[PDB]
Amino acid sequence: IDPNEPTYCVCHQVSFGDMIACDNENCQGGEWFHYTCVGLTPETRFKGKWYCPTCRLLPQ
């Protein structure tokens, strides 16, 4: 792991596996999320709406 490789997700780790992007362009929760960290089944698509654990609790 190169120290320059960006980290992501709730877990603050580099990219690995399947990842999903928070729909919020201004996401402050980690932008991209490893499927396992967010309860998604590996090697599946996710066609519809998805917010990360932070953005899904933000007031609208």
Binding site: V14, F16, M19, I20, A21, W32, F46
Partner: peptide
Amino acid sequence: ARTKQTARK
């Protein structure tokens, strides 16, 4: 949602 598969397991 946008999803991706990355090389690293």
